[PDB]
Design a protein around this nucleic acid. Sequence first.
DNA 1: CCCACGGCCCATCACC
DNA 2: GGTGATGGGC
DNA 3: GTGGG
Length: 325
Amino acid sequence: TLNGGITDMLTELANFEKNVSQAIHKYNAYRKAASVIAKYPHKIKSGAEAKKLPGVGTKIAEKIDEFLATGKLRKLEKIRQDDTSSSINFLTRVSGIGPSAARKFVDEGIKTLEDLRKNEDKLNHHQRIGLKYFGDFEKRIPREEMLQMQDIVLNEVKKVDSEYIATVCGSFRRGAESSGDMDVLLTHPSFTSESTKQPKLLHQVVEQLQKVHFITDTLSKGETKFMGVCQLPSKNEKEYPHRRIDIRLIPKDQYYCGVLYFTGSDIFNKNMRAHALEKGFTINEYTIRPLGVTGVAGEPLPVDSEKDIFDYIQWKYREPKDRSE
DNA sequence: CCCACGGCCCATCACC
DNA sequence: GGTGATGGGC
DNA sequence: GTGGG
Ligand SMILES: Nc1ncnc2c1ncn2[C@H]1C[C@H](O)[C@@H](COP(=O)(O)NP(=O)(O)OP(=O)(O)O)O1
Ligand SMILES: [Mn+2]
Ligand SMILES: [Mn+2]
Ligand code: NA
Ligand code: NA
């Protein structure tokens, strides 16, 4: 919010690279720039000034100058005029359409929401839903509403089995007053790392949430990972917006490693994994393993609470709300 | 003065 | 029908 | 596009 005009300008450039040029590195750099550029406590008022920030370099500093000097940036503007590049960017905002599906659709003449519907034949299921809820999906969720959602989920999960475990992770757990999707994490004592596999254990609890017409439609669904759509109920009235809900089922013993992952910033999850590597470990969404001076991953370490990981690699315990990187 | 640069689950497609 | 690769998302 | 090396 300090250097806001810059963060926006860069976030656009990042989306462009990801969406159009399929240059994920140049994308991530603009994000790390723009990400860790607002972590900065000082109004940037020089590209040369900005260059001193980590991940900000010659080109971005060159581009920052033009924005500070003229209030615009020719490059981005040129992209906005390209009727094609703009059409590729936009479509990716549909869920299920990525850089590949999007460049392939604009080639064949599909440039707008209007074409998508006409060409619904071409679209696969996930994309058929991202279209349906295109508007409601670009809205943010406020905690007040999120809090309601959290009550239903827990209610209907226990009602299936008293021994279940379910924690709302992601933006919400970090104090985030606004949220994009609802990230959920499910476990059971009867599901641990050394058990064969899940006997309808995730399906069981999804059905209930569909039975109470909370989960409306379904984007993807497997034995471990469910992506879908949910909605709150209104009294009297105006309908609530449809929202994205991710539900992930993990084994109980690995629970504290997934809660940590699926909560802390994608950058945070990257900030800490770096330290863990420098500090001799390799963590992931399920385990924290040690690495011999050769680099050979050892057997999974014992984890009984989120704080455990944050001693192994040391680091200052950043409690979820402080983890907004 | 170059060049790694992140990993996992689900769904679909191309090929057989 | 069963593959292995790829795309997409998070 | 960037910074480690
Ligand atoms: N490569 C990666 N890919 C996906 N998720 C990652 C990740 N690295 C870390 N995560 C962690 C970080 C994420 O928090 C978590 C999934 O949450 P999201 O729905 O992706 N985004 P969030 O909940 O943070 O905010 P909001 O929903 O309001 O936009 O997984
Ligand atoms: Mn989220
Ligand atoms: Mn999510
Ligand atoms: Na720098
Ligand atoms: Na999208």
